[PDB]
Amino acid sequence: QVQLQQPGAELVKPGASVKLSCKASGYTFTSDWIHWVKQRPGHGLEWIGEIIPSYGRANYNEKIQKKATLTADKSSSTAFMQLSSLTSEDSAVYYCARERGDGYFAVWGAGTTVTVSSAKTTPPSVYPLAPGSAAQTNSMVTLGCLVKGYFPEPVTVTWNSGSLSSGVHTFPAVLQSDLYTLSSSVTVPSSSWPSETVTCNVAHPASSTKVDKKIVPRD
Amino acid sequence: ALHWRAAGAATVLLVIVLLAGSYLAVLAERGAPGAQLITYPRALFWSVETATTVGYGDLYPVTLWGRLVAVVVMVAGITSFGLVTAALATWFVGREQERRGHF
Amino acid sequence: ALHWRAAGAATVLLVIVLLAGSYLAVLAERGAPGAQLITYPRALFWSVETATTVGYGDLYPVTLWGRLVAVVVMVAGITSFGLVTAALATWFVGREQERRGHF
Amino acid sequence: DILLTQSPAILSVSPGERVSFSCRASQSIGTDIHWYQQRTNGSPRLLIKYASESISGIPSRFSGSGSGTDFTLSINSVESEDIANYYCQQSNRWPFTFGSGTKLEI
Amino acid sequence: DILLTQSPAILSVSPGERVSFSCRASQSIGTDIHWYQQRTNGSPRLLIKYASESISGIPSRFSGSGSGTDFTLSINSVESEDIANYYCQQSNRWPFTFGSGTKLEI
Ligand SMILES: CCCC[N+](CCCC)(CCCC)CCCC
Ligand SMILES: CCCCCCCCCO
Ligand SMILES: CCCCCCCCCO
Ligand SMILES: [K+]
Ligand SMILES: [K+]
Ligand SMILES: [K+]
Ligand SMILES: [K+]
Ligand SMILES: [K+]
């Protein structure tokens, strides 16, 4: 029951534009304000603008350059932000937030990762990472999952569809030749493998793809 | 009863003005740097202390349309109080000429 | 006399509202950082300048219940003034139709 | 507008120790400050609204205080799940602004 | 009275780059600040009235912001005709005062 639903990611050519969305479930009062917050990687929160869907009026941040245009559709309960004439400086994560008109942001969206580059969309390549057949196992055996050659960010990785939540490290991606490379690790008991099945779920929203990979011990 | 029609309608009008005025004040004040009348709960109290002409100064509009809304809230509260006071006076007068023997 | 009953009761009601309002304001404002309506002597003067709709702005509530108490003090002082004014008008009218020869 | 300065940038603390972040405004904003939590690759989460009042679902571990130009978010006995980025936001004047942020490390 | 401090005195910027002048008042003046442009051997020209609102005839290149004691005039993509002296003026209190001025060089 995500109150504010946003697309995963968006790829925009330099100089082009994109229309971000924020579908709103839950209670929708006539006093609701939809705010949009920009956040760069490794940076803080920046307020872009607000809009009241019941009236259609929008305000913006005067201290920065007007790259956004806020609209709304009351029939579908979805606010829109039009980012036009994008450069590399506009590549960030854009959240949408609902304010009940009392000052604070009660609920946030998942955020949309907007990437502005001339490179093309490439689906990820998932490779199993099983330990060597001559490696020793303690009471815990660490398994991995290799995700390389994708563009652009991000990618989501789960182990056994989330049931293996504890003991998971997903390392930040590395950019090389307009391509990203990511690795993820999972720590399961040595008795839980290869007895129980372990699978990494890699989803690339920018290419609308999602694949799994069973970690089978090396022959 | 004409005096109870005018007083009864004015009070209903006042309630509509107080609620809409609180809503329209926030809508008109946001977008103006420095404005403090930008949240509905305290804007609801601002409309009351405006219609009753108390006007502490803790909250006030700074924009044109915020001030136009304030004027409407001022006039609504004042005229409603003038009609109710008038309606009470005629009610007491008519009640006073009764009890004696005048109908 | 109905008009003297309503004016006499409203003034009594106003005195109760002024004293209780001064007490309830301090009780509702303490616990809110920044509040200045937190001592009974000056809260007693605040209720008077609120009921009379003077509202200097030297003293005002910042909480919800402090503002709700303020609303009650506003309405009590305004309606009491509206009833007394109405009662005076009917008193003068009845006094004026007397002295001539109308009873 | 109103600039919100957060200190320190990074805050080191031992487990089980009461910690305190600081948020300070360019001018007096009464108690119209709000605190948010943002973990790694996550979305901001409201912890404290209007300086001291709590939020349902947020542990009693978190508490806020202050008024005017000095606000503080405290954590009694910091544990591992408290490791995130903490932001403060004012709603006293238009426009709403955010603090620079404070990272918590254990 | 109210003194308006303009910084910097001279502002160097590359063509096509967003630039920003700063005007600051001795005390809070809300948004009652106004910006003027004066080219070589020319008369002052109103660009921005009341901090952020625009003026007909002036390009959308120019924009203003700020409130209280900190005001800013910005220029998206500076071109050659922007080379002039920029002044700010307050109308919040009597008397009206001007800023010291900022020269723009490309
Ligand atoms: C002698 C001025 C009295 C102030 N009044 C009456 C307050 C009674 C407590 C405020 C109107 C409150 C509806 C009338 C002002 C008329 C302009
Ligand atoms: C009646 C409320 C209308 C408010 C519109 C404000 C528009 C300000 C634009 O600068
Ligand atoms: C009528 C007076 C009641 C005051 C109660 C204030 C409680 C505030 C709790 O935060
Ligand atoms: K008055
Ligand atoms: K007053
Ligand atoms: K006042
Ligand atoms: K004052
Ligand atoms: K004052």
Side-chain angles (χ1 to χ4, degrees), chain C residues 24-25 27-31 63 65-66 69, chain D residues 53:
Chain C
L24 292 174
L27 183 65
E29 290 292 293
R30 289 197 183 186
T63 62
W65 288 102
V69 166
Chain D
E53 301 175 340

PDB file of all heavy atoms in Angstrom, chain C residues 24-25 27-31 63 65-66 69, chain D residues 53, ligand 3:
ATOM      1  N   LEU C  24      -7.438  28.701  32.159  1.00  0.00           N
ATOM      2  CA  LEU C  24      -7.271  27.642  31.169  1.00  0.00           C
ATOM      3  C   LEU C  24      -6.216  27.992  30.129  1.00  0.00           C
ATOM      4  O   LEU C  24      -5.617  27.090  29.532  1.00  0.00           O
ATOM      5  CB  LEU C  24      -8.608  27.341  30.491  1.00  0.00           C
ATOM      6  CG  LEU C  24      -9.668  26.688  31.382  1.00  0.00           C
ATOM      7  CD1 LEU C  24     -10.994  26.558  30.648  1.00  0.00           C
ATOM      8  CD2 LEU C  24      -9.191  25.330  31.876  1.00  0.00           C
ATOM      9  N   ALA C  25      -5.974  29.284  29.892  1.00  0.00           N
ATOM     10  CA  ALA C  25      -4.940  29.675  28.938  1.00  0.00           C
ATOM     11  C   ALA C  25      -3.555  29.285  29.438  1.00  0.00           C
ATOM     12  O   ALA C  25      -2.766  28.683  28.701  1.00  0.00           O
ATOM     13  CB  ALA C  25      -5.011  31.177  28.666  1.00  0.00           C
ATOM     14  N   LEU C  27      -2.831  27.013  31.628  1.00  0.00           N
ATOM     15  CA  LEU C  27      -2.760  25.556  31.674  1.00  0.00           C
ATOM     16  C   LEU C  27      -2.495  24.959  30.298  1.00  0.00           C
ATOM     17  O   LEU C  27      -1.832  23.923  30.187  1.00  0.00           O
ATOM     18  CB  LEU C  27      -4.059  24.995  32.255  1.00  0.00           C
ATOM     19  CG  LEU C  27      -4.165  23.485  32.459  1.00  0.00           C
ATOM     20  CD1 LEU C  27      -3.167  23.008  33.501  1.00  0.00           C
ATOM     21  CD2 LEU C  27      -5.583  23.104  32.854  1.00  0.00           C
ATOM     22  N   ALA C  28      -2.998  25.598  29.243  1.00  0.00           N
ATOM     23  CA  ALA C  28      -2.843  25.082  27.891  1.00  0.00           C
ATOM     24  C   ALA C  28      -1.578  25.570  27.202  1.00  0.00           C
ATOM     25  O   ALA C  28      -1.106  24.909  26.270  1.00  0.00           O
ATOM     26  CB  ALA C  28      -4.056  25.462  27.039  1.00  0.00           C
ATOM     27  N   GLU C  29      -1.024  26.705  27.630  1.00  0.00           N
ATOM     28  CA  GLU C  29       0.167  27.253  26.992  1.00  0.00           C
ATOM     29  C   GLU C  29       1.458  26.701  27.576  1.00  0.00           C
ATOM     30  O   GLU C  29       2.444  26.556  26.845  1.00  0.00           O
ATOM     31  CB  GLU C  29       0.167  28.780  27.097  1.00  0.00           C
ATOM     32  CG  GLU C  29      -0.880  29.456  26.230  1.00  0.00           C
ATOM     33  CD  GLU C  29      -0.588  29.323  24.748  1.00  0.00           C
ATOM     34  OE1 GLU C  29       0.417  29.902  24.283  1.00  0.00           O
ATOM     35  OE2 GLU C  29      -1.359  28.638  24.045  1.00  0.00           O
ATOM     36  N   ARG C  30       1.480  26.394  28.871  1.00  0.00           N
ATOM     37  CA  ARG C  30       2.663  25.792  29.469  1.00  0.00           C
ATOM     38  C   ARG C  30       2.881  24.397  28.899  1.00  0.00           C
ATOM     39  O   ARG C  30       1.932  23.637  28.691  1.00  0.00           O
ATOM     40  CB  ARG C  30       2.530  25.737  30.990  1.00  0.00           C
ATOM     41  CG  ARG C  30       2.631  27.098  31.664  1.00  0.00           C
ATOM     42  CD  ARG C  30       2.911  26.960  33.150  1.00  0.00           C
ATOM     43  NE  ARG C  30       2.939  28.253  33.829  1.00  0.00           N
ATOM     44  CZ  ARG C  30       3.278  28.422  35.103  1.00  0.00           C
ATOM     45  NH1 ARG C  30       3.627  27.379  35.845  1.00  0.00           N
ATOM     46  NH2 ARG C  30       3.271  29.635  35.637  1.00  0.00           N
ATOM     47  N   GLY C  31       4.144  24.068  28.643  1.00  0.00           N
ATOM     48  CA  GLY C  31       4.502  22.870  27.917  1.00  0.00           C
ATOM     49  C   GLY C  31       4.785  23.104  26.450  1.00  0.00           C
ATOM     50  O   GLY C  31       5.220  22.173  25.762  1.00  0.00           O
ATOM     51  N   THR C  63      -0.884  27.487  21.168  1.00  0.00           N
ATOM     52  CA  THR C  63      -1.312  26.100  21.116  1.00  0.00           C
ATOM     53  C   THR C  63      -2.734  25.997  20.565  1.00  0.00           C
ATOM     54  O   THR C  63      -3.406  27.000  20.306  1.00  0.00           O
ATOM     55  CB  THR C  63      -1.228  25.459  22.501  1.00  0.00           C
ATOM     56  OG1 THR C  63      -2.114  26.138  23.400  1.00  0.00           O
ATOM     57  CG2 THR C  63       0.186  25.534  23.035  1.00  0.00           C
ATOM     58  N   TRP C  65      -5.435  24.314  22.201  1.00  0.00           N
ATOM     59  CA  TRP C  65      -6.400  24.570  23.264  1.00  0.00           C
ATOM     60  C   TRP C  65      -6.294  25.992  23.792  1.00  0.00           C
ATOM     61  O   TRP C  65      -7.299  26.563  24.229  1.00  0.00           O
ATOM     62  CB  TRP C  65      -6.222  23.555  24.393  1.00  0.00           C
ATOM     63  CG  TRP C  65      -6.689  22.188  24.002  1.00  0.00           C
ATOM     64  CD1 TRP C  65      -5.913  21.132  23.624  1.00  0.00           C
ATOM     65  CD2 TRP C  65      -8.046  21.737  23.923  1.00  0.00           C
ATOM     66  NE1 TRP C  65      -6.702  20.048  23.326  1.00  0.00           N
ATOM     67  CE2 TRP C  65      -8.016  20.394  23.502  1.00  0.00           C
ATOM     68  CE3 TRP C  65      -9.284  22.337  24.174  1.00  0.00           C
ATOM     69  CZ2 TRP C  65      -9.174  19.640  23.325  1.00  0.00           C
ATOM     70  CZ3 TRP C  65     -10.433  21.589  23.998  1.00  0.00           C
ATOM     71  CH2 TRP C  65     -10.370  20.254  23.578  1.00  0.00           C
ATOM     72  N   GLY C  66      -5.099  26.582  23.756  1.00  0.00           N
ATOM     73  CA  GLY C  66      -4.982  27.994  24.075  1.00  0.00           C
ATOM     74  C   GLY C  66      -5.749  28.863  23.099  1.00  0.00           C
ATOM     75  O   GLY C  66      -6.386  29.845  23.490  1.00  0.00           O
ATOM     76  N   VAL C  69      -9.520  28.303  23.728  1.00  0.00           N
ATOM     77  CA  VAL C  69      -9.930  29.149  24.846  1.00  0.00           C
ATOM     78  C   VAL C  69     -10.046  30.600  24.396  1.00  0.00           C
ATOM     79  O   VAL C  69     -10.975  31.316  24.789  1.00  0.00           O
ATOM     80  CB  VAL C  69      -8.948  28.995  26.024  1.00  0.00           C
ATOM     81  CG1 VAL C  69      -9.159  30.102  27.044  1.00  0.00           C
ATOM     82  CG2 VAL C  69      -9.113  27.634  26.678  1.00  0.00           C
TER      83      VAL C  69
ATOM     84  N   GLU D  53       6.848  16.811  19.396  1.00  0.00           N
ATOM     85  CA  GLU D  53       5.782  15.820  19.297  1.00  0.00           C
ATOM     86  C   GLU D  53       6.236  14.600  18.503  1.00  0.00           C
ATOM     87  O   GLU D  53       6.974  14.716  17.520  1.00  0.00           O
ATOM     88  CB  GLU D  53       4.548  16.446  18.648  1.00  0.00           C
ATOM     89  CG  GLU D  53       4.011  17.651  19.405  1.00  0.00           C
ATOM     90  CD  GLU D  53       2.862  18.322  18.689  1.00  0.00           C
ATOM     91  OE1 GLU D  53       2.726  18.110  17.467  1.00  0.00           O
ATOM     92  OE2 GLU D  53       2.095  19.058  19.345  1.00  0.00           O
TER      93      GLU D  53
HETATM   94  C1  LIG F   3      -8.538  22.944  28.298  1.00  0.00           C
HETATM   95  C2  LIG F   3      -7.066  22.945  28.704  1.00  0.00           C
HETATM   96  C3  LIG F   3      -6.438  21.601  28.346  1.00  0.00           C
HETATM   97  C4  LIG F   3      -4.948  21.799  28.078  1.00  0.00           C
HETATM   98  C5  LIG F   3      -4.314  20.445  27.768  1.00  0.00           C
HETATM   99  C6  LIG F   3      -3.012  20.643  26.995  1.00  0.00           C
HETATM  100  C7  LIG F   3      -2.430  19.273  26.654  1.00  0.00           C
HETATM  101  C8  LIG F   3      -1.286  19.420  25.651  1.00  0.00           C
HETATM  102  C9  LIG F   3      -0.616  18.059  25.464  1.00  0.00           C
HETATM  103  O1  LIG F   3       0.445  18.170  24.553  1.00  0.00           O
END
